[PDB]
Amino acid sequence: EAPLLAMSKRTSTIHVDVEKAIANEDAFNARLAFWIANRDNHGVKVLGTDESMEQFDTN
Amino acid sequence: EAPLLAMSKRTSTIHVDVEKAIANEDAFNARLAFWIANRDNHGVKVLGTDESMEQFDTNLADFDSIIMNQYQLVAAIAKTPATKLLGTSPKGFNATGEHETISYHEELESIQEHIFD
Amino acid sequence: LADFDSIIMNQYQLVAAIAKTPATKLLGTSPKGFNATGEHETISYHEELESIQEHIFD
Amino acid sequence: LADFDSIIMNQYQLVAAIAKTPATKLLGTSPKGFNATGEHETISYHEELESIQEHIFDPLLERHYLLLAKSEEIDVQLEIVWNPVDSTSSQQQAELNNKKAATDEIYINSGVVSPDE
Amino acid sequence: LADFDSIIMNQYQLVAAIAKTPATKLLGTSPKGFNATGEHETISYHEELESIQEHIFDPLLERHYLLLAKSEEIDVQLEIVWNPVDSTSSQQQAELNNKKAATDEIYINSGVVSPDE
Amino acid sequence: MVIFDEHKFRTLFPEFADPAAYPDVRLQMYFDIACEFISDRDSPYRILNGKALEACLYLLTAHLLSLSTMQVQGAAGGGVTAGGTQGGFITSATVGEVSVAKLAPPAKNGWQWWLSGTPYGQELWALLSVKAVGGFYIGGLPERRGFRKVGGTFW
Amino acid sequence: MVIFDEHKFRTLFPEFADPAAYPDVRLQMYFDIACEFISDRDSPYRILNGKALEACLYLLTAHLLSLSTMQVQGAAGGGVTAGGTQGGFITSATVGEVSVAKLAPPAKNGWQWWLSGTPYGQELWALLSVKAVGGFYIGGLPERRGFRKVGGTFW
Amino acid sequence: VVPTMLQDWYNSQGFIGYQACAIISQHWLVDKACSMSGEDAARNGWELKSDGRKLSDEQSALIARRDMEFRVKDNLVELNRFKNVFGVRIALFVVESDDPDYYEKPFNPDGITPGSYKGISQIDPYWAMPQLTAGSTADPSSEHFYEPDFWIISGKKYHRSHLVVVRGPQPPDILKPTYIFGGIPLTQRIYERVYAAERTAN
Amino acid sequence: VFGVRIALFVVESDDPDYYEKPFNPDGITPGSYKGISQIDPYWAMPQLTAGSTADPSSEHFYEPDFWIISGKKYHRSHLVVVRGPQPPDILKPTYIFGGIPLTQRIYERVYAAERTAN
Amino acid sequence: VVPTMLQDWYNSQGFIGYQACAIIS
């Protein structure tokens, strides 16, 4: 259980207006797939107001 | 999982008015690319009101215990000391001693010799 | 950044594990926190692997 | 700034690892937190790397003596023997000499080697 | 201000590292947190760097003794031997002398060297 | 750069149909002005690309033209009053016995408040907001592509 | 420095078309004044660069001219009253049976409030806000270019 | 049964290739790992005993001269080093004979023509090509099964007995040809772990 | 420091093509050993013969038979060559037939250590 | 097979040059 839970240790999320992301659904998830592919500790994520990101980690 | 997560340890995010950002969207990307290129701990970032720029980081201190517990279990199945397999005793475990040396050098190797016989 | 050292010196210890060579020989010293290299590792390297290389040379 | 020292003396230890030279020799002492340098590192440097450098040197001295002795008027060829490289202290040297003298006395008394050797 | 001491002594340790001289010799003592200076550092300083400096001095003394001896009325050429440089305490020096005297007695009794040597 | 034709604009906004009331050069000048607010550099990686960007620009020129024709017509006593007439969203109006009370837009910024003044700007703001989802991620290299993963992915 | 001409200003603002009502020297003086609020130093690294910057300056000149014509025309009883007439956004107005109530701008600052006081200043405020996205970054050196990264990048 | 995910996680550790091994070997960690393993074993040297008590001094001097001219220590150190680098190393003892098909027959201790031992050479795996006979491929019961009988180095095919082959951990039979009948390379064992360690240090 | 070093034993002989033949211990002319010199790699140019390049089976494969130092070409046997970790054959010419230099091994790590200590 | 990212990360460590070695020394 320690390795298996350590795989899903961090659970970072993002609170984007889903009723607006619904309209496009392809540019949005393409952009987020690009973000996940190029995730790094130097790049910065621009996200609009009324968005909170927020992240959890397990002990 | 410790190196790969350590790569994406810090996840700083900036709250820019995106509906304003889309309007130009070239100068904005150029400016932030310039920031990311010349990022330093002495330069200062200007960002207007209604802008937060929060930052998140991950805690990775507990991965070592998991890794060395699993390698110790690898040695446990292998019936071979973790000093022989991993090259040394794992994290936090008591230093290998006379009990393990007689458990390996005398027991399993005599079994292998009687297999060779 | 206090938790990066553990990751680095665990991965270098793993490199030593692959190489079947002590971290004292490869990295120049024992890695972070690990018990000081001793008689067990010296007989595991000086006697075992080097005799393997010698019977390869033979 | 408490976490900068660990990074600094991890990177200097890595530099020593590249150089195949102890951090005691390069940095002047063992780096922060690391176990104190011991007999394992002492034999890994004094006995191994110096022997590698000596067998690198050996073609140079061999050709130098081949083109010195044979070029001048000589009768017998030459061969080089390497002094031990331990650079041990005066007390350790005196203890070494005393133990070797004990071996000499034991061998002479038992009738193995003459005092001429 | 608790973290300034680590930075200060980390930089002084690097000054010692570049100077190839122990921090005990330069700073007057071992820096903050570092392991106490030992036999490895004493042989690394007293035996290595000072032998380098003596072989640097050797051209000077050799030319000086050439231009002194040969210029004045002499008969036999001259050579230089270097004293050991350990600067050990009086108790250690007495122990060194006693061990050397034991070696002398053993060799004389076994009939290796005469008391004249 | 995006070229501004008049056929598309006049069919899209029938109220701006009369050339005498709305000359060619006036529409062209207001398109050049709207290019300053929204950059007309067309790229395939932009969130506003192609027809969406063109519609955004045309809506902004309609906004500017409506404000300008409001300025020109007035009217106080048959002309333009001193200091002009200000825009903004009419929250509540009352004429005679008739009264209207509309919902205020969530204008948290001067740009949004100015856009809400005319319905062309309201449509432009709606298009910008509906295209504003998620955001951008500038910088960052594929660090994860050098570490092996489950199922032999990205060795 | 940016040179100001009467022709572009007059075609931009048809209300300011009469040279008798708005002399050339008045427009030039208000342009020199508006240069203080927005510096006319044209650079290619500025966010207000080129035509956007000129449009911003022209809008501010229209703002100042609107305040000036408010002051000179008045009118109380055929002239200028004591202490003049103050600007600011008309939140609510009522003439006879007609009543209008407009949404207030999000003016959190005196400069923004003074801009929102007139419709030209409202357009100027909208342009400044829409160009004011992101920000700058002063200082800092390419520290990351000295450290090797994934894929042999910036060794 | 093994799951599909574990199965294709284990199957992906394939043979990277000799070009990849040579390119990766430039790195310091892999070079040191392949270097200071047999070099330390070779450091202390060896002694010669023979059936007799002591070899005659002229014979010992001749042996020392020939060993120095052949640079035996350096050759065997390089042998172990590149055996660790690649999967397999081939050492060919060069010797002269009148027959131009000399390296075709099985090696015989009698076919000497004295004063012909000129030295040894080490051939990298990409310069060679193993060749398997039908007798060395048809019979699993054969003790030479999946053991290259010949090695084409430069056109000509040297016999297995003529040359000395040192190989890695000797992979199983079904995927022995996938390694060109060599061994599992230590470069393949540590080109990902070394990268992870260096990037974390970075 | 570099990938390779060349040590040349200077010795005097009447033949101006002396450093062309393979080195012979008999070609002495006694009282001719004047000393040794060490030549940096950028002052030298290895030259490979067809016999030392055509045959992988040859023990001198990818071993420079000559070294052009100052116009003239010194033979391999005349001089003593010390080299680094000896890279593999396919990229041995990329190192000018020398070795892997310790400066290449530690110019980035040393920079990182210094800048972090800095 | 070797991945492209690991492959060119290892391949980027080429021979810097004698001038670079001298200036870094």
The DSSP annotation for D9-21 comes to HHHHHHHHHHHTS
- For the purposes of burial, counting CB atoms within 10 Å of the CB of H176, is it exposed (0-12), middle (13-18) or buried (19 or more)? middle
DSSP for J1-25 reads: ---HHHHHHHHT-----HHHHHHH-
Q: What is the resolution of this structure in A?
A: 3.2
Subunit contact H33:C51, Cβ cutoff 8 A? no
Q: Do chains A and E touch (3 or more CB pairs under 8 A)?
A: no
Joined together, the tokens standing for residue E26 give 């330069």
* Separation between Cα atoms, residue H196 and residue F147, nearest integer Å: 7
Interface check for G76 against chain F (CB to CB < 8 A): the answer is no
List the beta bridge partners of residue I4. I83
Contacts of I101 (CB under 8 A, 6+ apart): I1, I2, I3, I84, J15, J16, J21
Dmax over CA atoms of chain J, in Å, equals 38
CA distance B1 to chain F (A): 9
- Chains J and B physically touch (3 or more Cβ atom pairs below 8 Å): no
Contact call for residues D4 and I113 (beta carbons, < 8 A): no
Q: From the CA of A56, how many Å to the nearest CA of chain B? A: 9
From H40's Cα to the closest Cα of chain I, the distance in A is: 15
Do residues H93 and H163 lie in contact, with contact meaning Cβ atoms separated by under 8 Å?
A: yes
Nearest to G32 by CA among G7, G64, G8: G64
For chain B, which residues lie within 8 Å of any Cβ of chain C, measuring from their own Cβ?
Answer: 2-3, 6, 59-61, 63-64, 67-68, 81, 83-89, 91, 95-96, 101
Is B12–A44 a contact, with Cβ atoms under 8 angstroms apart?
A: yes
**What are the structure tokens assigned to D98, written together?**
């005393």
Is E18 exposed, middle or buried, given 0-12, 13-18 or 19+ CB atoms closer than 10 A? exposed
CB atoms within 10 A of CB G109: 10
Q: CB-based contact (8 Å) between A38 and chain F?
A: yes
Provide the greatest CA pair distance for chain G.
80
Helix (H, G, I), strand (E, B) or coil at H101: coil
Query: H186 to chain C: which residues are within 8 Å by CB?
Result: 18-19
Q: What is the CA radius of gyration of chain H?
A: 20
> Could you say which DSSP state residue E62 is in?
H
- Sequence letter at residue H51: D
d(CA D112, CA C30): 44
Identify the CA nearest to H22 among candidates D100, B5, I95: I95
Nearest to G108 by CA among F71, F110, E14: F110
- CA gap A18, F130 in Å, rounded: 11
Token pair 């999982």 is found at B1
First vs last Cα of chain C: how many Å apart? 50
Q: Chain H residues with CB inside 8 Å of B4's CB?
A: 196
Return the structure tokens found at H157.
Answer: 């095919």
Asked whether the beta carbons of B11 and A12 are under 8 A apart, the reply is yes
Contact in structure between D22 and E17 (CB atoms under 8 Å)? no
H131: β partners: H150
The identity of residue H180, as a single letter, is I
d(CA H22, CA H15): 13
Q: Is the peptide bond before F75 cis (omega within 30 degrees of 0)?
A: yes
Residue type (1 letter), A20: K
Which one-letter amino acid corresponds to residue G23? P
Contacts of I34 (CB under 8 A, 6+ apart): I10, I11, I12
Non-local (6+) Cβ contacts of G9 within 8 A are G16, G27, G58, G61, G62
d(CA C51, CA D98): 34
Q: Give the count of beta carbons closer than 10 Å to the beta carbon of residue G2.
A: 15
Do residues I68 and I47 make contact, with C-beta atoms less than 8 angstroms apart? Answer: yes
Per-window interface: I 5-64 vs J, CB < 8 A: 40-42
- Return the closest-CA partner of residue G116 out of B19, F102, F112: F112
Cα distance between residue G152 and residue G150, in whole Å? 6
φ, ψ of residue D45 in degrees (nearest 5) = -100, -55
Q: Which residue of G has its CA nearest to B4?
A: G150
Pairing of strands H117-123, I72-75: unpaired
Residue given tokens 């665990």 in the structure block: C10
Provide the shortest C-alpha distance from residue I114 to chain E (in Å): 10
Mutate to test the interface with J, among I103, I107, I109, I111 (most CBs of J within 10 A): I103
Q: How far is CA B31 from CA B12, B15, F109, G45, in A?
A: 17, 15, 22, 10
Residues A35, A37, A39, A40, CA torsion sign: negative
